[PDB]
Amino acid sequence: EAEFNSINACLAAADVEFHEEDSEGWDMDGTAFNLRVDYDPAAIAIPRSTEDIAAAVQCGLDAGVQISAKGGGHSYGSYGFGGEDGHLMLELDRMYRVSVDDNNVATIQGGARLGYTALELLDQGNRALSHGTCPAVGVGGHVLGGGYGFATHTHGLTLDWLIGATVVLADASIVHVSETENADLFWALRGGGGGFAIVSEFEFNTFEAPEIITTYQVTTTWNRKQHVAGLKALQDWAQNTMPRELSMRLEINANALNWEGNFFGNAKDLKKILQPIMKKAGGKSTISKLVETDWYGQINTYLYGADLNITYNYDVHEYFYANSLTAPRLSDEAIQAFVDYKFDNSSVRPGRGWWIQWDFHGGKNSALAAVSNDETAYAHRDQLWLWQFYDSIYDYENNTSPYPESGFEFMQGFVATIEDTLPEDRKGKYFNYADTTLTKEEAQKLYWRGNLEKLQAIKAKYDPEDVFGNVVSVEPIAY
Numbered sequence: 001e002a003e004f005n006s007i008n009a010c011l012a013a014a015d016v017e018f019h020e021e022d023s024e025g026w027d028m029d030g031t032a033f034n035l036r037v038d039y040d041p042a043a044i045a046i047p048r049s050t051e052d053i054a055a056a057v058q059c060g061l062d063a064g065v066q067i068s069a070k071g072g073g074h075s076y077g078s079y080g081f082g083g084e085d086g087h088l089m090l091e092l093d094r095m096y097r098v099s100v101d102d103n104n105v106a107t108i109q110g111g112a113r114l115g116y117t118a119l120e121l122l123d124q125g126n127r128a129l130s131h132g133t134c135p136a137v138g139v140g141g142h143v144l145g146g147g148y149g150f151a152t153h154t155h156g157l158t159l160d161w162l163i164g165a166t167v168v169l170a171d172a173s174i175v176h177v178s179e180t181e182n183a184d185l186f187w188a189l190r191g192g193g194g195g196f197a198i199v200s201e202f203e204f205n206t207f208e209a210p211e212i213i214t215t216y217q218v219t220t221t222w223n224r225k226q227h228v229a230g231l232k233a234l235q236d237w238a239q240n241t242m243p244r245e246l247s248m249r250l251e252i253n254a255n256a257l258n259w260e261g262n263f264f265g266n267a268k269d270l271k272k273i274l275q276p277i278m279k280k281a282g283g284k285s286t287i288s289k290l291v292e293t294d295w296y297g298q299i300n301t302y303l304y305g306a307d308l309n310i311t312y313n314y315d316v317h318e319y320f321y322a323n324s325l326t327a328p329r330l331s332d333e334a335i336q337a338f339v340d341y342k343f344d345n346s347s348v349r350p351g352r353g354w355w356i357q358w359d360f361h362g363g364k365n366s367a368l369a370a371v372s373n374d375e376t377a378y379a380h381r382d383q384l385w386l387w388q389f390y391d392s393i394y395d396y397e398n399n400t401s402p403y404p405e406s407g408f409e410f411m412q413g414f415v416a417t418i419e420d421t422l423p424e425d426r427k428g429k430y431f432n433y434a435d436t437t438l439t440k441e442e443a444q445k446l447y448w449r450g451n452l453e454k455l456q457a458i459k460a461k462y463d464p465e466d467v468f469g470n471v472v473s474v475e476p477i478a479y
């Protein structure tokens with residue numbers, strides 16, 4: 001029944017399942033992954049079809065509230081909730097069908113997650129897609145922001161494999177999009193973030209699961225000076241040497257700096273590639289992981305304790321503050337400042353912890369960079385580096401200090417070490433690694449840089465009344 005909620009009444013009338021605010025379902029779906037930014041929705045609809053989504057949207061329109069689609073709910077700013085209280089939430093994780101046709105084209109429902117998807121792709125023709133490491137991530141938010149992982153240097157972003165989708169617009173209409181149909185909306189869905197439309201189904205091209213993948217890890221024992229020289233070497237290497245079939249990211253925390261990634265080939269060939277750079281980077285390191293496995297194998301190497309096959313029964317949480325950054329080749333000042341920050345400004349109380357992922361994002365041999373900033377809404381094709389900053393409170397149930405009041409300064413200063421040295425137009429951030437301290441105006445310019453204005457015009461055309469907007473999303477502004 002729809003006691004005390006006019007939206008639930010509307011959904012009920014349209015035969016659309018919902019969660020009453022007094023139910024356990026509300027507890028599960030209504031609580032964000034990042035408890036530091038949990039929000040209270042106006043209602044939660046649970047669509048099972050494209051029609052249910054449109055019906056849910058109409059009800060949102062009737063109520064005069066904004067509507068937020070939630071895929072896997074892994075957004076760092078809880079944008080599946082709209083990034084604030086009061087939105088109608090459309091929990092889509094009950095819509096996770098994955099079907100691969102004879103052309104190796106995969107149809108994936110808007111609420112499917114990476115783990116489940118990867119399993120289906122493997123089971124249905126031994127296919128694969130380029131995506132992140134977390135099995136819980138929703139395919140939806142992932143592809144709308146890009147989709148970065150250990151296959152990006154070789155196969156680009158998750159969105160570079162998107163060829164079409166079935167979506168529901170702000171006015172509840174249902175349309176099809178592709179490079180030849182509503183091409184402007186399609187462009188926007190490929191990197192534009194949330195708020196353009198609600199995707200009921202995605203259409204992906206796929207590549208055959210590689211017969212062999214060699215995962216690896218290099219452990220360094222570098223001091224301050226060695227960190228600087230190492231990164232400089234790694235940088236020249238990333239731009240002029242690093243092979244297409246090799247991905248890499250640096251795991252960085254208070255006491256370590258490790259290189260890790262996947263290689264689409266054999267261990268012997270990989271060792272021949274790693275040795276020269278390890279030497280160029282000044283030695284003081286060794287290979288701590290080197291194993292040949294298969295697609296399924298590489299996937300299960302980066303789960304970090306997470307269940308692999310996740311659908312609609314998900315109740316995992318964390319309490320943290322994240323940040324990100326994209327940038328071109330760095331000068332000695334940036335690298336030197338970054339290192340000094342780790343060595344002199346990264347002390348945290350017990351119960352608190354941090355890490356940074358230094359991603360070999362662009363470069364000459366990166367497939368990601370083989371696509372121009374004009375080809376999709378993704379606007380960082382010209383950036384060599386991508387970073388993720390993660391500040392977390394492990395014992396949040398007992399103590400969250402310095403949060404919610406403060407704490408942001410730590411990672412913000414960390415980002416600043418590199419960002420402050422860049423020309424305004426080159427400063428950027430990755431929407432999938434959202435920084436919640438940004439204003440809608442700051443966020444738009446950083447997440448979409450050069451493509452912002454075009455995205456705003458497209459947004460103006462497809463959602464002029466910003467029905468699907470969240471707190472930092474592209475706004476409806478016509479040229």
Ligand SMILES: *Cc1cc2c(nc3c(=O)[nH]c(=O)nc-3n2C[C@H](O)[C@H](O)[C@H](O)COP(=O)(O)OP(=O)(O)OC[C@H]2O[C@@H](n3cnc4c(N)ncnc43)[C@H](O)[C@@H]2O)c(*)c1C
Nearest residue numbers: 071072073074075080110132133134138140141148194199
């Ligand atoms: C928690 C978590 C996040 C991760 C992880 N690993 C990642 C990785 O290896 N690479 C990445 O590139 N990103 C990783 N992320 C970061 C982000 O969590 C993801 O990239 C996605 O943004 C998360 O997607 P999802 O879980 O679906 O997020 P929601 O918060 O539900 O919504 C995000 C956002 O976009 C909209 N949206 C989602 N789904 C749809 C559909 N079907 N249609 C329209 N819009 C959709 C939301 O409304 C919102 O704006 C690893 C971990 C553990």
Ligand SMILES: O=C1N[C@H](CO)[C@@H](O[C@@H]2O[C@H](CO)[C@@H](O)[C@H](O)[C@H]2O)[C@H](O)[C@H]1O
Nearest residue numbers: 132133134251252302304355357388390
């Ligand atoms: O984008 C990402 N995001 C997630 C976080 O949302 C990262 O996970 C973390 O990766 C860390 C190691 O880099 C682990 O120690 C930690 O437990 C684990 O949760 C993951 O490695 C990375 O791919």
Ligand SMILES: *[C@@H]1O[C@H](CO)[C@@H](O)[C@H](O)[C@H]1NC(C)=O
Nearest residue numbers: 116119120123308309310311
């Ligand atoms: C994943 O879960 C779904 C539904 O619970 C199930 O149908 C599927 O077989 C599972 N995948 C596995 C474990 O192969």
Ligand SMILES: *[C@@H]1O[C@H](CO)[C@@H](O)[C@H](O)[C@H]1NC(C)=O
Nearest residue numbers: 340341343344345346409413
């Ligand atoms: C970092 O620490 C140094 C001393 O170790 C201090 O001088 C500096 O102000 C700190 N930087 C910031 C802005 O936190």
Ligand SMILES: [Zn+2]
Nearest residue numbers: 001003020022
């Ligand atoms: Zn009731």
Ligand SMILES: [Zn+2]
Nearest residue numbers: 021040041042
């Ligand atoms: Zn409420």
Ligand SMILES: [Zn+2]
Nearest residue numbers: 243244245246
């Ligand atoms: Zn090669």
Ligand SMILES: [Zn+2]
Nearest residue numbers: 333334420421
């Ligand atoms: Zn300077």
